[PDB]
Amino acid sequence: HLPLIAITRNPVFPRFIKIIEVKNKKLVELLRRKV
């Protein structure tokens, strides 16, 4: 029950490490709520 992430054009194939860098800064507040 968490808001859908902004993929912002970033495929993540299974068992494949990947990095996410969304341009909106609002998601960082969600990042601080998951720590």
């Binding site: 859908l4 993540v12 194939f13 299974p14 068992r15 494949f16 490490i17 990947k18 990095i19 996410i20």
Partner: peptide, 14 residues
């Protein structure tokens, strides 16, 4: 991010 647990929710709206 990594791919560890796949899942297919029947309805994301709920």
């Amino acid at each position: 991010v990594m791919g560890h647990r796949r899942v297919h929710i029947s309805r994301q709206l709920e």
